Design a protein around this ligand. Structure first.
Ligand SMILES: [Zn+2]
Length: 204
């Protein structure tokens, strides 16, 4: 890609990554992410638990921002906006505006990006040192827009990139994952893993 920046995960000097709690589905689960494909399956507006793990010392005041992009190369130049019905349905919820489908829980000093010259959409969160018992930064992400939203994604998946850097602007730990909401996380993971397993059969 020459137009938009690269989407390569860092996990370098800090070997920091995003950990999503997974659990085998029996018929219908909440959060189901495929490790092999690094894809996440959730329900519309369902809580998406994300864990920020690191290996080296991260700045006492590191800023970790998460942005949603159009991984769909066929529409990578198609930025996702807020639907007119989604903006008219609700106005205020938890400090997050309808314009942004991404939401953060347990926020302290977060800021929503929206440059008037670039019109970029991304949320930034302040560093919160690990707690005796976790050793990782637990951030809860909520998406108020599923791929089903013909007036939003239009059957186009989106990839979220969580970057952790200093105020000076130095990426220390930044990775990206795929988010798929369709009120069927266990059905998407079981159907994607079960359908992808066979990979064709008849043909002619
Ligand atoms: Zn929508």
């Amino acid at each position: 890609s020459s137009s938009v920046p690269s989407q390569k995960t860092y996990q370098g000097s800090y070997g920091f990554r995003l950990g999503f709690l997974h659990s085998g589905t029996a018929k219908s689960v909440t959060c189901t992410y495929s490790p092999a494909l690094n894809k996440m399956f959730c329900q519309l507006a369902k809580t998406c638990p994300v864990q920020l793990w690191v290996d080296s010392t991260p700045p006492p005041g590191t800023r970790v921002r998460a942005m949603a992009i159009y991984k769909q190369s066929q529409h990578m130049t198609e930025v996702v906006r807020r639907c007119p019905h989604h903006e008219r349905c609700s106005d205020s919820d938890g400090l997050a505006p309808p314009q942004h489908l991404i939401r953060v829980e347990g926020n302290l000093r977060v800021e929503y990006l929206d440059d008037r010259n670039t019109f970029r959409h991304s949320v930034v969160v302040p560093y919160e040192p690990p707690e005796v018992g976790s050793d990782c930064t637990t951030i809860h992400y909520n998406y108020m827009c599923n791929s089903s939203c013909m007036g939003g994604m239009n059957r186009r998946p989106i990839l979220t990139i969580i970057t952790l850097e200093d105020s000076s602007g130095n990426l220390l730990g930044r990775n990206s994952f795929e988010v798929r909401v369709c009120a069927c996380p266990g059905r998407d993971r079981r159907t994607e893993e079960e359908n992808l397993r066979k990979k064709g059969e008849p043909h002619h």
